From a paper:
In the base there is a “plug” that sits in the center-most portion sealing of the nucleocapsid; further analyses revealed that the plug density has C7 symmetry. The interactions among the AC101 dimers, as well as between AC101 and AC144, are almost identical to those described in the inner layer. Hence, the AC101 dimers in the inner layer link both the outer shell and plug together, and thus stabilize the base.
Baculovirus Autographa californica multiple nucleopolyhedrovirus (AcMNPV) has been widely used as a bioinsecticide and a protein expression vector. Surprisingly, the C14 symmetric base had nearly identical features to that of the apical head, except for that in the central regions. Both the head and base could be further segmented into three parts: an outer shell, an inner layer and a central region.
Numbering used by the authors:
A (entry chain N): 39 to 157, 193 to 271
B (entry chain K), C (entry chain L): 112 to 338
D (entry chain M): 6 to 158, 198 to 271
Write the structure that this text describes.
């Protein structure tokens, strides 16, 4: 089961990388977000990641049933402390606002590289690095948090969506494996992880 | 005697013509014409009534003065004297329109030596303990202010390089890379970013409780308690 | 009389406090404000000297009144009485500054919303326009001529008060003092005095850049791309 | 708490990378980012300057000190001590002035320099500290406004009084920046800074040569009102 699920997880990560390559963005991801001037590529990444999560969660529906916009903010006053992905609906169209500085902080946080757990052919090819894979995983999980909130907003009212924004205990109402919500490893159910605070 | 009445009156004639025929024409005139007109009007005893009338036109244009018909009659006499124009097209209504034109012209800002604008940023440090929802609403009010930029609403199927060769090369290349280390790094980065944001905003964040709710509740009720 | 002596006196006091570079606070101005100021100047024979100087300056600056010491001294005493401030703080420097200010204001068409322009240009010394660097070198030569006034070799160690009680009492006494307003006043005063020096010495200066370069450069290297 | 313990677990396995951290970074960011702390720092620096002046054997208030045209000894000592204070603030390990300085205090038009009221030079190994009395007394005679215009966007000390000390502190800040630039490099570099000030981006990085320090103005950012 671990072998099967590890294969599935790395396959999903490969699909993630492949899609974000199909976006045809000549700028590197770290430089994608470092660039304060152009929000087009960053918002394209966010939109495509929302599409990726929506279709993996709901394979049977393909075409978008919604219209979305993006507002990119680069100041302290705007930044919500914990959810840099500001996602909401305004006047019949959803808006996914983003705090760029928080993300450029995240993807530049001295990623661990050493394995502290202590336990013709080849030539030029597609080569990746641990930092890039970790950054992609963090981005995918963050946008998954955003999509969880979007699904709560759709299945409830804005009042209940805000109360979820206050509590976050409301994720567990409907996201189970069902004929409507198609199972999915969700990219974070693969591992449990708890805190050892005093 | 020290005051040249002739030039003052000559400039005042054009000024009153423009302001009485409702020809504002800010280009033509400057403050000098207005002040010469005012001095000439104040000079003779005849126009002291008009001077008193225009006194309250400087700042309080909502207070209608209370006056009788005889005072307005004498004021019309003074207006006909000053304009030197036949009273056929002159009446109290044109006088009040000219009064409004004078008030608007008077309240015009002119010039300043500039100023060191020390307003800028303050970083908005509350210096108190701060909640969650209050910060969320107060900040979101400024979040939704203006500037919606990105317009991607068409709705399109996600592009896929469905060929497995690109997938196979990558998937073989990812074999040596563990999942535990990557997931640890991601969680640790998220924790650091959240604590940084709470430190910057000085919000009363559950020390290790809310994100613990995230983790434990999500994992457990995914694994069991499905309902 | 129909003129309010108190109202117009205080309005003229404000206008002189500002246009004569003696005050700090800025109050948004209207044309009627200057009109009332000049009318109050008219009504007072004692300030008729400034009033008639304004009258002369209405048209153009091809002429300037010729006065002896007596008229100038009486005018200076009148200005001191109007300002109600230390007497010797104004002098012919302030007199010419006020003259140039009012002359610039009286000319030019009435604008929709202010002008926000300094008055250093075409204010003093109709003679020429000399380079600033040459003035620096020449005047520094005279500065370095003679009479250094103190020989302090050993140097006295700086006195320090470790008694927190006095530091805390001083801190308590600074409790009502707002940092923002005090700093705004200080910066504005320094900038205005520097502009006075630039005007008087007739060394043309980068009004919009050089001081802005000071501010921008210092802040940027204090925060961004420090390296 | 003293510890914050972080763990990333794993499904179907028990090994954890359990890391524990401290509140030093979180609380430090909270307090330093909080504007109250930096306001406290600014008030503390000003209190230290005031205590220095009080212990300087000076019982007369600042402006009254600068009114004494006869003796410039007090003014020279005041400037000297403020230079010493700023020298302390950049480099606490040094307190005294190892080089003997001489003050050339003037009350003339030519010696006044538009932009550096206190120019600092050197003449064959002995240091020259120009004091320009007319400019500084012009600065300290602007009657700072005190009414509540905050625009947030026991002792005989008031707003405007301490405001003058703050203005002097800023003046000495500029003077000391020029002096330090002069001492680190040649006279050409010092004069070029006097003409362009671009050397502010050369040596004043937060390093061993220059260890941070507030410089005061970093507390409040200010700009011109240009178009």
């Amino acid at each position: 089961l671990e072998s099967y699920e590890t294969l599935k997880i790395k396959l999903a990560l490969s699909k993630y990388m492949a899609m974000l390559s199909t976006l045809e963005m000549t700028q590197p991801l770290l430089e994608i977000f470092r660039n304060k001037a152009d929000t087009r590529q960053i918002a394209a990444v966010v939109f495509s990641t929302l599409a990726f999560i929506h279709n993996r969660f709901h394979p049977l529906v393909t075409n978008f049933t919604n219209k979305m916009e993006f507002v990119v903010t680069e100041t302290n006053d705007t930044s919500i402390p914990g959810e840099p992905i500001l996602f909401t609906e305004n006047e019949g169209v959803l808006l996914c606002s983003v705090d760029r500085p928080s993300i450029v902080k995240m993807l530049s946080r001295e990623f661990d590289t050493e394995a502290l757990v202590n336990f013709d052919m080849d030539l030029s090819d597609f080569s990746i690095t641990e930092v890039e894979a970790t950054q992609y995983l963090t981005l995918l999980l963050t946008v998954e948090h955003a999509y969880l909130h979007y699904y709560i907003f759709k299945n409830y009212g804005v009042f209940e969506y805000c109360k979820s924004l206050t509590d976050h205990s409301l994720f567990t109402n409907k996201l189970r494996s069902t004929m409507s919500t198609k199972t999915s490893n969700l990219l974070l159910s693969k591992f449990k992880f708890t805190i050892e605070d005093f | 005697e020290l005051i040249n009445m002739r030039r003052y009156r000559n400039a005042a004639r054009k000024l009153i013509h423009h302001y009485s025929l409702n020809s504002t024409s800010s280009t033509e005139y400057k403050i000098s014409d207005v002040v010469m007109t005012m001095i000439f009007l104040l000079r003779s005893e005849k126009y002291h009534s008009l001077f008193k009338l225009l006194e309250t036109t400087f700042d309080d244009y909502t207070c209608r003065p209370q006056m009788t018909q005889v005072q307005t009659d004498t004021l019309l006499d003074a207006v006909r004297s000053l304009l030197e124009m036949p009273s056929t097209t002159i009446d109290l209504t044109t006088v009040d329109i000219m009064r409004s034109s004078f008030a608007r012209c008077f309240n015009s800002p002119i010039m300043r030596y500039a100023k060191i604008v020390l307003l800028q940023n303050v970083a908005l440090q509350r210096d108190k303990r701060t909640t969650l929802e209050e910060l969320l609403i107060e900040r979101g009010e400024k979040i939704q202010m203006l500037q919606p930029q990105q317009y991607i609403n068409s709705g399109t199927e996600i592009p896929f390089c469905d060929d497995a060769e690109f997938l196979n090369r990558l998937l073989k290349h990812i074999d040596p890379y563990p999942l535990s280390r990557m997931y640890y790094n991601a969680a640790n980065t998220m924790f650091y970013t959240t604590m940084e944001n709470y430190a910057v905003s000085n919000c009363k964040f559950n020390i290790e409780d809310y994100n613990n709710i995230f983790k434990v509740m999500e994992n457990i009720r995914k694994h069991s308690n499905k309902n």
